[PDB]
DNA sequence: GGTTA
């Protein structure tokens, strides 16, 4: 079982592994890159926009989230990520800021001088409750087609992320 | 693949 110190060392390495997946810390993901890359992310939802249908283009279902982790500062909102779906509205249903969110298969690219995340068509995700909340229904029912089965390792990471987020925002 | 946002 990991504690907050190990979590921080993990993140400070830029790239880190949890189970079978390799993630990129939010801060490193914010680094401006010339060429797009595909990554996995695990952070706290610092802000979000409820799912809705795009008005133009292919009109995909879309939800925006701002992901944060201990490598950014309480002052930055984090990495802006647009999650899309062309297979119905099966996007993460987020209820409040503070929820841990794990994203699998997110394209990182440059836009207006900032790195932005764009979900791959087949992206997957895991969403946790905002543990630090008094409310007990922070994690509502989620659509199934993009859900990832997770275990205790990811559970601890989520618990720690939320805790740190809370200590730094409370 | 980066329109949609």
Swiss-Prot record:
This is Protection of telomeres protein 1. GO terms for molecular function: G-rich strand telomeric DNA binding; single-stranded telomeric DNA binding; telomerase inhibitor activity. The gene is pot1. Keywords: Chromosome, DNA-binding, Nucleus, Telomere. It is found in: Nucleus; Chromosome, Telomere. Transmembrane segments: none annotated. Single-stranded telomeric DNA-binding protein that is required to protect the 3'-end telomeric overhang. It binds the consensus sequence 5'-GGTTAC-3'. Regulates telomerase and telomere length. The chain holds residues 5 to 174 of 555 of the full protein. Self-associates. Interacts with ccq1, poz1 and tpz1. Its main location: nucleus. GO terms for cellular component: chromosome, telomeric repeat region; cytosol; nuclear telomere cap complex; nucleus; shelterin complex; telomere cap complex. GO terms for biological process: regulation of telomere maintenance via telomerase; telomere capping; telomere maintenance. Belongs to the telombin family.
